[PDB]
Ligand binder design. Structure first.
Ligand code: FAD
Ligand code: NAP
Length: 532
């Protein structure tokens, strides 16, 4: 589908973010078009088609709320939706609002440059398209550029190589194979139990163990759903008015104030219920090392009790960082998997990987021969997608250069020096620290409301004020430094990627507080922006 040469708004990306931007700008009477690398809609849910791929937020919360019809018509079937289901949902939405008519697929944005003479962006693609747009919305994701681990010999491996973030579109058959998985984040934890059912032998190459708690998935009772639908807009407002964008209970006590007995009984309740709600069991879990440690120990002990061989069990136990400060993962039959004779936990803290070889993986202790190797090694998060594009602001400043020591933004939404450019649910905003459908919807509404305001008032140039950006950055850093999150190497701090600057990238104050600030900024005529 040939993109238009001129448009009010150009949107990069056709995942949840870009699809809602497209729809809402259409409803606002603006010309808008999307460019997307993928062959079809869905973003993460299009790319991450590995077996076992599944959301870690309840289905009834991980969904769009902008359409009453969608909320009433769609039937989720389980507690946590699988990738195939979520992709059917996204297709449903795209069909319902005729969105593909406004999207060019199989096309990658390669560069974009602001023209101060015209107050427009000129955007290039890898098909030779040149598009001129007044406003540029980067809906290009947070976890959208797969990261390879930092090991030699990958190109020499003679077997089949996969990354979970670029999985094949046809099922992959691992029957009778010796298979390795590198990475035990959410992606490794989900894929490994599925591989284990086909492989002759599965080797799981763990570096730092990640905390994971049971999902306790279950079918969603259609009666509960029908009931929820009679108050769905209300239920969703309840979610928007929280720090996390879900119904998670905000435990009012301190993990230090309670007795050991009360702690165990309260944590046991969360462990049996399943899901990530334990993160908020007590108010200070992410704020006080000793509080955090009480919870962490309870979890570590549950992990130990899951695997019979106590040497294997102990190698599964996360150490050296606070519970919750790498993103909490939900597991289904992952720990149980290691009791199987054909699954092998390779502890690469103890025996670091030296190289990939034609046959497999060599650690400092031995060579593992493999027919296939699956990389669940994560993503170049938050900034990665943007840094693959040659984005140039005023005075030919490269975004990649301005952000070389970390992302610098006002509200996460724009950066000084780069007018008319907006980032959806990225650094400087709650982003992944909230249910992302809540984060995404609020960003899309705020940005598209702003663009509508500009057009209504006959303005053409919107730029974040440098001083306000510097004050925002410092503020993000100061509130993060009251938490334990900067203490740990995670993708939230860029520690994922050799050479990337280590700074915590997200707003930790909660979605609700962030939303209030955004509302106040807009109400005052976009204070901290200069509009002309
Ligand atoms: C496997 C996985 C599971 C997740 N599960 C949850 C969860 O349970 N709960 C939660 O809150 N969040 C979770 N997320 C986080 C997730 O990023 C969001 O929930 C949301 O799906 C992001 O939507 P988005 O549209 O902002 O970005 P994406 O879904 O990443 O879509 C961005 C799109 O932009 C395209 N693109 C990027 N650069 C260019 C370019 N230069 N030119 C053209 N196109 C480009 C990409 O191909 C992609 O299709 C998960 C993420 C992953 C990776
Ligand atoms: N259930 C879901 O909803 C779901 C599923 C998948 C992903 N997600 C989202 O996507 C995010 C990313 O998850 P992920 O599991 O893809 O990535 P990840 O959380 O970034 O984990 C990457 C894994 O790869 C290992 N790794 C990276 N580089 C390595 C190297 N050079 N050598 C050895 N190991 C290496 C890491 O070890 P170290 O920890 O030791 O670095 C870690 O085990 C999640 O946190 C979440 O936001 C959600």
């Amino acid at each position: 589908r040939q993109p238009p040469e001129e448009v009010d708004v150009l949107v990069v990306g056709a995942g949840f973010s870009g699809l809602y931007a497209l729809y809402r700008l259409r409803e606002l009477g603006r010309s808008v078009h999307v460019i997307e690398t993928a062959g079809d809609v869905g973003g993460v849910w299009y790319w991450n088609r590995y077996p076992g791929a599944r959301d870690d937020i309840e289905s009834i919360e991980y969904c769009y709320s902008f359409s009453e019809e969608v909320l009433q018509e769609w039937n989720w079937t389980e507690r946590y939706a699988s990738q195939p289901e979520i992709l059917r949902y996204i297709n449903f939405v795209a069909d319902k609002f005729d969105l593909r008519s406004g999207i060019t697929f199989h096309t990658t944005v390669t560069a974009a440059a602001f023209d101060e003479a015209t107050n427009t962006w000129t955007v290039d693609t890898n098909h030779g398209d040149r598009i001129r747009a007044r406003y540029l919305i980067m809906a290009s994701g947070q976890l959208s550029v797969p990261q390879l681990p930092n090991f030699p010999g990958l190109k020499d491996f003679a077997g089949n190589l996969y990354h979970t973030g670029n999985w094949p579109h046809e099922p992959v058959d691992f029957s009778g194979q010796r298979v390795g998985v590198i990475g035990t984040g959410s992606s490794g934890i989900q894929v490994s139990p599925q591989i284990a059912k086909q492989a002759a032998e599965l080797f799981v190459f763990q570096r730092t163990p990640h905390f994971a708690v049971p999902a306790r998935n279950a079918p969603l009772d259609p009666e509960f759903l029908a009931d929820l639908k009679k108050r769905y807009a209300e239920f969703r407002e309840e979610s928007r008015n929280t720090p996390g964008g879900t119904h998670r209970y905000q435990g009012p006590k301190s993990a230090l104030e309670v007795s050991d007995e009360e702690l165990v009984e309260t944590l046991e309740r969360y462990w049996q219920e399943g899901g990530p709600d334990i993160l908020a069991a007590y108010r200070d879990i992410l704020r006080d090392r000793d509080a955090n440690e009480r919870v962490a120990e309870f979890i570590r002990n549950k992990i130990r009790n899951t695997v019979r061989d106590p040497e294997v069990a102990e190698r599964l136990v996360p150490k050296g960082y606070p519970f919750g400060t790498k993103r909490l993962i939900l597991e289904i039959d992952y720990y149980e998997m290691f009791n199987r004779d054909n699954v092998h936990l390779v502890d690469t803290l103890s025996a670091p990987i030296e190289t990939i070889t034609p046959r497999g993986v060599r650690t400092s202790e031995r060579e593992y021969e493999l027919d296939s190797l699956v990389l669940a090694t994560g993503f170049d998060a938050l900034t990665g997608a943007l840094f693959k594009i040659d984005i140039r602001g005023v005075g030919n400043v490269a975004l990649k250069e301005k952000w070389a020591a970390g992302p610098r933004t006002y509200l996460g939404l724009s950066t000084a020096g780069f007018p008319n450019l907006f980032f959806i649910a990225g650094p400087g905003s709650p982003s992944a620290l909230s249910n992302m459908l809540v984060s995404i919807e609020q960003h899309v509404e705020w940005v598209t409301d702003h663009i509508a305001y500009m057009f209504k008032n006959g303005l053409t140039r919107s730029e974040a004020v440098l001083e306000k950006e510097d004050e925002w950055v410092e503020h993000v850093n100061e509130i993060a430094d009251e938490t334990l999150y900067p203490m740990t190497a995670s993708w939230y701090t860029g520690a994922n990627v050799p050479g990337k600057p280590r700074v915590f990238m997200l707003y930790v104050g909660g979605f609700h507080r962030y939303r209030q600030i955004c509302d106040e900024v807009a109400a005052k005529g976009y204070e901290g922006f200069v509009l002309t």
